[PDB]
Write a protein that binds this ligand. Structure first.
Ligand SMILES: O=C1C[C@@H](c2ccc(O)cc2)Oc2cc(O)ccc21
Length: 212
């Protein structure tokens, strides 16, 4: 009984299947990001986080039988989702048009702050973030356009870009670095991520699946 979610008219199917891996994922949660200007929240993108179907078996052990309220306050729960032994797929869709460099600037900012924060930001990670940036330079995201982050548990982050919301057939780049590979999702549902809309969805939707 996993539902779909719509954010500012951008729909996120309950399940999807990757053309690059052949795996299927279920929608863990959706939300929105933007900027607060003069006390006003200005929407720019929508975000949906998908978890590989096998994530349920992996998470069942420690989190089955926990209440949504209980999960929402347990940081360890989100750590297992971020670093769990399964693929995660994040789809960011634009509400307002942003060029590749415009969108990526803030994302890289947050990723770099996190990496430096946990003491894992050396030359390799800096070079990986440079490659990350490079991948976005030739892209533009008009309303409805999407970016796909495929977090592989093998320490690789795959980047895809779509003119709309459909999953690209091929990936535009592969960032091969363990620390950086989870940085993006970290800044969305990790401990130091202020917006809690995504964390709440995860806390609310997982319990049902973890039981069956
Ligand atoms: O989905 C987004 C939007 C993006 C953004 C919004 C407005 C803007 O002007 C530039 C970038 O910031 C982010 C930063 C992150 O760590 C993770 C996700 C996002």
């Amino acid at each position: 009984s996993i539902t779909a979610i719509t954010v500012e008219n951008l729909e996120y199917p309950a399940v999807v299947t990757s053309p690059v891996t052949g795996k299927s994922y279920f929608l863990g949660g959706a939300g929105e990001r933007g900027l607060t200007i003069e006390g006003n929240f200005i929407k720019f993108t929508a975000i949906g986080v998908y978890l590989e179907d096998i994530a349920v078996a992996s998470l069942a052990a420690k989190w089955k039988g926990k209440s949504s309220e209980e999960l929402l306050e347990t940081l360890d729960f989100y750590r297992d989702i971020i670093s769990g032994p399964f693929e995660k797929l994040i789809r960011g869709s634009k509400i307002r048009e942003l060029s590749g460099p415009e969108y990526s600037r803030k994302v890289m900012e947050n990723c770099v702050a996190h990496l430096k924060s946990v003491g894992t930001y050396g030359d390799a990670e800096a070079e990986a973030m440079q490659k990350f940036a490079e991948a976005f330079k030739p892209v533009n995201f008009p309303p409805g356009a999407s970016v796909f982050y495929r977090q592989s548990p093998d320490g690789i982050l795959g980047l895809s870009f779509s003119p709309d919301t459909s999953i690209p057939e091929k990936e535009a780049a592969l960032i091969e670095n363990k620390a950086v590979s989870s940085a993006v999702l970290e800044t969305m549902i990790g401990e130091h991520a202020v917006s809690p809309d995504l964390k709440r969805c995860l806390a609310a939707r997982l319990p049902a699946l973890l039981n069956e």
